[PDB]
Amino acid sequence: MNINEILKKLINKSDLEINEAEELAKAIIRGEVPEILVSAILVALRMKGESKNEIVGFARAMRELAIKIDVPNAIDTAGTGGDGLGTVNVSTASAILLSLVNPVAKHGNRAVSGKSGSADVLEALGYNIIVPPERAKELVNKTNFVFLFAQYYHPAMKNVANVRKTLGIRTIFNILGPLTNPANAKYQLMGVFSKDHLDLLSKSAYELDFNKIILVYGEPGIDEVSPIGNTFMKIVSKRGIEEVKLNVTDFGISPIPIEKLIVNSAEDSAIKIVRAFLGKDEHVAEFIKINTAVALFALDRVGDFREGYEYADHLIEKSLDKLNEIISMNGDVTKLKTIVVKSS
Amino acid sequence: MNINEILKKLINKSDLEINEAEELAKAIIRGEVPEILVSAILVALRMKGESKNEIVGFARAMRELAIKIDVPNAIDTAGTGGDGLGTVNVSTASAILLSLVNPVAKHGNRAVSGKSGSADVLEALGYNIIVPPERAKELVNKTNFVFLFAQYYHPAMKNVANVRKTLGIRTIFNILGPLTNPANAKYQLMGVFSKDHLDLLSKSAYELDFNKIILVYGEPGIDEVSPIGNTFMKIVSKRGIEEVKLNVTDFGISPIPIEKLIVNSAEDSAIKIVRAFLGKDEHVAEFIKINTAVALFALDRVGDFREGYEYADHLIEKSLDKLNEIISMNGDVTKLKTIVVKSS
Ligand SMILES: O=P(O)(O)OC[C@H]1O[C@H](OP(=O)(O)OP(=O)(O)O)[C@H](O)[C@@H]1O
Ligand SMILES: O=P(O)(O)OC[C@H]1O[C@H](OP(=O)(O)OP(=O)(O)O)[C@H](O)[C@@H]1O
Ligand SMILES: Nc1ccccc1C(=O)O
Ligand SMILES: Nc1ccccc1C(=O)O
Ligand SMILES: Nc1ccccc1C(=O)O
Ligand SMILES: Nc1ccccc1C(=O)O
Ligand SMILES: [Mg+2]
Ligand SMILES: [Mg+2]
Ligand SMILES: [Mg+2]
Ligand SMILES: [Mg+2]
């Protein structure tokens, strides 16, 4: 593994082989490459345009260097983020409904591009987002749910923190979070923030050994099932990649006004979700249900998305109680109660 | 002038305005840009493909921060280098011939591309490559020749040294060398290692205020007048850019065996050069004269390249003596004679 040829090869706009990319990623994440070179590598990679092998190679590298736990049967709903609209944390919400019928290993981080990421809303609900691996396995067996905080499950990533911050631009690292579930979940719903990335990340995923991952991109440009119109998805599995185009009306619902799904803080998002669980906010609930519907389809619990949406309706009615039992076992339920009044 | 804005601009592949580039180069060369961003900008600049305005901006910034001496009537023969063949230092040797007819202010540097760059071979002959400005003036008036060591006359350049070395790849600075002659020479034969750059650089030179400068790209793939076939060149003057193709036979000579023009060390190059001066190496001698011939055409001392090659035939005869005179005034003639002895 020579850093120089690698760089020259990227400067010449030549895609790397999977093993090349993985060895490169391993060296970078281990902190064995000078910042000047790490910076050049990431910039060349972005200007060349990352290819599937490089995404696969980097993903495998991070998985191998991360703190792990074994729960392949679990499902994750994390998306790449980056759309920037600041909508309510729908995948975290959706992760709660799913824990009622399947173990859930939700990989996530805090935010900065909206001051309300998956980790922030959980904390605001009273959950203790910092879970040790041994304790994490126990929580999933008892409550069928656990949140895997990325900062803490991928420590080696600190070796690239300075370069990434100093650069201040998007790099290959900004789209790998969802492909590096610390629990090696085989089933997943992964939102991508751009149509272009849909094709690249789905081919990469195809080689990252999932049982079934569904990647989606929804209008007007979010990494979720679209609440206002069309959604473009890729259904990846051992068999291949299936393409699917869907409109929000296919869920047997009318387009939701995106203004009702935007939040301005962690607590506000926490309240939108609890109100949705209480039946006091049908727009947020719908958004949650259309997303959970596709996840249900990924688990093959329903035959189609309409069925998935209907099934999700039964789940959302038991989600507040499920949320209470999850938090009570890892966090402070008094905060959950507070948020409950604050929405009642 | 904000570095992050510059970086995003380059990541988007938008050429910089002349003044933006100059300000950028000034900040980098002054050492006020973080190594991480300096690195990212050099890579982005190269992957985007530097433009005429960027070359011009950088050139102007370097000239401004350079240590200068007065000799515009002088001529330089330095090339951009980077062709990797590891050929004998023909422009340095060709510079010795020219001092026999015009003051020569040779701009040069050491190398790693074989271990035999212009400065390396001069050191092997016994020359004292670090010549202070005041002393550089005397040497030119006396012997009509003086070597301007790039690492000495561009002191601020040591601020971008760590990044350039660490990167270990070609960047914009690798083609700025000859366009930043410390004596502000108005006449010059500038070599280029690729046809593409032959276009880019010629257009840039046109705005760098020369009287006449000829850029050439050798056929085998070197930045010299081709010794085995075609030579592509552009003659830049106040009145415009003239194009001219040329074959090595147009010098009334037969194609030279390129494998006999290849060096493997500093002394190896000195020995070759000396041998040509002793008339013991026609091939190495013929290579020197076709290049010298074109530089003569640039000084308008000949009306065609055949004459220049003829007149160059006269000069080479008196070359060993001129060399001895040069080195004895600024250097160790003892070393020279050892090389003479080794040459035979
Ligand atoms: O900023 P957004 O419009 O929500 O879109 C970014 C991602 O976040 C959503 O869930 P959640 O809020 O739980 O975030 P996460 O998936 O990034 O953890 C969903 O998973 C999206 O893929
Ligand atoms: O690597 P090359 O095939 O020689 O080509 C690079 C340049 O070097 C040659 O002279 P010299 O060897 O003295 O180098 P310099 O001009 O770069 O100082 C000539 O000036 C070329 O323009
Ligand atoms: N978007 C994500 C999904 C899962 C884990 C981490 C991230 C992250 O952005 O750091
Ligand atoms: N940005 C990330 C992507 C993947 C995994 C962890 C991180 C992190 O910041 O900790
Ligand atoms: N090629 C050159 C020509 C003149 C001065 C410096 C250089 C250099 O490469 O540093
Ligand atoms: N490579 C160069 C080009 C121009 C001026 C100085 C240098 C230098 O290396 O010091
Ligand atoms: Mg998400
Ligand atoms: Mg989202
Ligand atoms: Mg040269
Ligand atoms: Mg040359």
**Complete DSSP assignment for A133-181:** HHHHHHHHHHHSEEEEEHHHH-GGGGGSHHHHHHH-S--GGGG-GGG--
Cα distances from A128 to residues A125, A141, A319, in angstroms, run 9, 17, 18
Sign of the dihedral through C-alpha A95, A99, A100, A103 = positive
HEC per residue, chain B:
CCHHHHHHHHHCCCCCCHHHHHHHHHHHHCCCCCHHHHHHHHHHHHHHCCCHHHHHHHHHHHHHHCCCCCCCCCEECCCCCCCCCCECCHHHHHHHHHCCCCCEEEEECCCCCCCCCHHHHHHHHCECCCCCHHHHHHHHHHHCEEEEEHHHHCHHHHHCHHHHHHHCCCCHHHHCHHHHCCCCCCEEEEECCCHHHHHHHHHHHCCCCCCEEEEEEECCCCCCCCCCCEEEEEEEECCEEEEEEEEHHHHCCCCCCHHHCECCCHHHHHHHHHHHHCCCCHHHHHHHHHHHHHHHHHCCCCCCHHHHHHHHHHHHHHHHHHHHHHHHHCECHHHHHHHHHHHC
Domains of chain A: 1-70+150-181 (1.20.970.10), 72-149+182-343 (3.40.1030.10)
Nearest to A93 by CA among A221, A257, A272: A272
Which amino acid appears at position B190 of this protein? Answer: M
Max CA distance (Å), chain A: 62
Experimental approach taken: X-ray
CA atoms of B276 and B270, how far apart (whole Å)? 10
Cα distances from B226 to residues B191, B220, B229, B316, in angstroms, run 11, 7, 6, 19
Q: Is A73 exposed, middle or buried (0-12, 13-18, 19+ CB in 10 A)?
A: middle
Task: Say what the resolution is, in angstroms.
Answer: 2.4
Q: Please provide the size of chain A in residues.
A: 344
Around ion ligand 9, residues with a beta carbon closer than 5 Å are: B 78-79, 91
Residues of A in contact with B7 (CB under 8 A): 167-169
Q: What are phi and psi of A318, to 5 degrees?
A: -115, 5
Q: Is A336 helix (H, G, I), strand (E, B) or coil?
A: helix
What is the enclosing helix (H) or strand (E) of A215? strand A212-218
Atom of ligand 3 nearest to the CA of A174: 9
Q: Could you tell me the two tokens for B208?
A: 């760098």
Asked if A78 contacts A192 with a C-beta cutoff of 8 angstroms, the reply is no
Contact of B44 with chain A, judged by CB distance below 8 Å, is answered with yes
Contact of A39 with chain B, judged by CB distance below 8 Å, is answered with yes
- Residue B145 pairs with which residues in a beta bridge? B104
User: Which residue, chain included where needed, has tokens 């050798």?
Assistant: B218
Q: What are phi and psi of B259, to 5 degrees?
A: -70, -15
Which amino acid appears at position B114 of this protein? Answer: G
CA atoms of B52 and B200, how far apart (whole Å)? 6
- Residue A15 is classified by DSSP as P
Residues of B in contact with A162 (CB under 8 A): 36
Residues of A in contact with B46 (CB under 8 A): 11
Q: Is A130 helix (H, G, I), strand (E, B) or coil?
A: coil
Nearest to A65 by CA among A166, A135, A125, A153: A153
End-to-end Cα distance, chain A: 59
HEC per residue, A38-82:
HHHHHHHHHHHCCCHHHHHHHHHHHHHHCCCCCCCCCEECCCCCC
Max CA distance (Å), chain B: 60
Asked if B43 contacts B9 with a C-beta cutoff of 8 angstroms, the reply is no
> What is the least distance, in Å, from the CA of A204 to any CA of chain B?
24
Q: Which residue of A has its CA nearest to B12?
A: A47
Asked if A59 contacts A286 with a C-beta cutoff of 8 angstroms, the reply is no
What is the enclosing helix (H) or strand (E) of A106? strand A104-108
CA atoms of A130 and A155, how far apart (whole Å)? 13
CA atoms of B203 and A101, how far apart (whole Å)? 69
Asked if B181 contacts B68 with a C-beta cutoff of 8 angstroms, the reply is no
Q: Could you tell me the two tokens for A36?
A: 């000047």
User: Which residue, chain included where needed, has tokens 């690698």?
Assistant: A6
Query: Is residue B14 part of an annotated ligand binding site?
Result: no
CA atoms of A292 and A297, how far apart (whole Å)? 9
Distance of CA A30 to the CA centre of its chain: 24
User: Which residue, chain included where needed, has tokens 């999933």?
Assistant: A140
- Ligand 5 lined by B312 (C-beta under 6 Å): no
Nearest to B116 by CA among B154, B90, B150, B80: B90
Cα distances from B61 to residues B28, B131, B165, in angstroms, run 10, 23, 21
End-to-end Cα distance, chain B: 59
DSSP-derived secondary structure for A175-209: G-GGG--TT--SEEEEE-S-HHHHHHHHHHHHTTT
- Ligand 3 lined by A78 (C-beta under 6 Å): yes
Q: Is A96 helix (H, G, I), strand (E, B) or coil?
A: helix
Query: Is residue A224 part of an annotated ligand binding site?
Result: yes
Nearest to B264 by CA among B124, B71, B135, B86: B86
Cα distances from A106 to residues A69, A150, A174, A321, B139, in angstroms, run 13, 10, 17, 19, 75
Asked if B298 contacts B214 with a C-beta cutoff of 8 angstroms, the reply is yes
Q: Which residue of B has its CA nearest to A162?
A: B36
Pairwise CB contact (< 8 Å): B40 & A167:
yes
Nearest to A77 by CA among A108, A55, A100: A108
Query: Is residue B76 part of an annotated ligand binding site?
Result: no
HSE-up (13 A, CA, CB side) for residue B320: 19
Q: How many angstroms does the Cα of residue A43 sit away from the middle of ligand 7?
A: 25
Atom of ligand 1 nearest to the CA of A114: 1
CA atoms of B315 and B276, how far apart (whole Å)? 12
Which amino acid appears at position B209 of this protein? Answer: D
Q: Which residue of A has its CA nearest to B13?
A: A47
Sign of the dihedral through C-alpha B201, B165, B78, A10 = negative
Pairwise CB contact (< 8 Å): B44 & A47:
yes
Q: Which residues are within 8 A (CB) of A158 and not within 5 positions of it... i.e. 6 or more apart?
A: none
Asked if A103 contacts A136 with a C-beta cutoff of 8 angstroms, the reply is no
- Residue B215 pairs with which residues in a beta bridge? B190, B234
Asked if B102 contacts B216 with a C-beta cutoff of 8 angstroms, the reply is no
Q: Please provide the size of chain B in residues.
A: 344
CA atoms of A204 and A234, how far apart (whole Å)? 12
Phi-psi region of A175 (alpha: psi -120 to 50; beta: other; left: phi over 0): alpha
Q: Is A286 helix (H, G, I), strand (E, B) or coil?
A: helix
Atom of ligand 4 nearest to the CA of A154: 6
Nearest to B124 by CA among B328, B344, B331: B331
Sign of the dihedral through C-alpha A224, A227, A233, A238 = positive
DSSP-derived secondary structure for A223-268: SSS-SSSEEEEEEEETTEEEEEEEEGGGGTSPPP-GGGGB-SSHHH
Sign of the dihedral through C-alpha A283, A285, A289, A295 = positive
Cα distances from A337 to residues A67, A125, A272, in angstroms, run 33, 9, 14
Q: CA dihedral in degrees (A127, A132, A135, A140; nearest 10)?
A: 60
Q: Is A88 helix (H, G, I), strand (E, B) or coil?
A: coil
Q: Which residues are within 8 A (CB) of B12 and not within 5 positions of it... i.e. 6 or more apart?
A: none
HSE-up (13 A, CA, CB side) for residue B300: 8
CA atoms of B223 and A103, how far apart (whole Å)? 66
Pairwise CB contact (< 8 Å): A47 & B167:
no
Query: Is residue B223 part of an annotated ligand binding site?
Result: yes
**Cβ atoms < 10 Å from Cβ of A303:** 9
Nearest to B198 by CA among B175, B177, B182: B175
Which amino acid appears at position B303 of this protein? Answer: G
Contact of A291 with chain B, judged by CB distance below 8 Å, is answered with no
Nearest to A54 by CA among A80, A28, A82: A28
Pairwise CB contact (< 8 Å): B168 & A35:
no
Q: How many angstroms does the Cα of residue B224 sit away from the middle of ligand 10?
A: 5
Pairwise CB contact (< 8 Å): B44 & A39:
no
CA atoms of B235 and B230, how far apart (whole Å)? 16
- Residue B291 pairs with which residues in a beta bridge? none
- Residue B16 pairs with which residues in a beta bridge? none
- Residue among B4, B11, B37 minimizing CB distance to A47: B11
The C-alpha angle A159, A160, A162, rounded to 5 degrees, equals 105
Asked if A263 contacts A276 with a C-beta cutoff of 8 angstroms, the reply is no
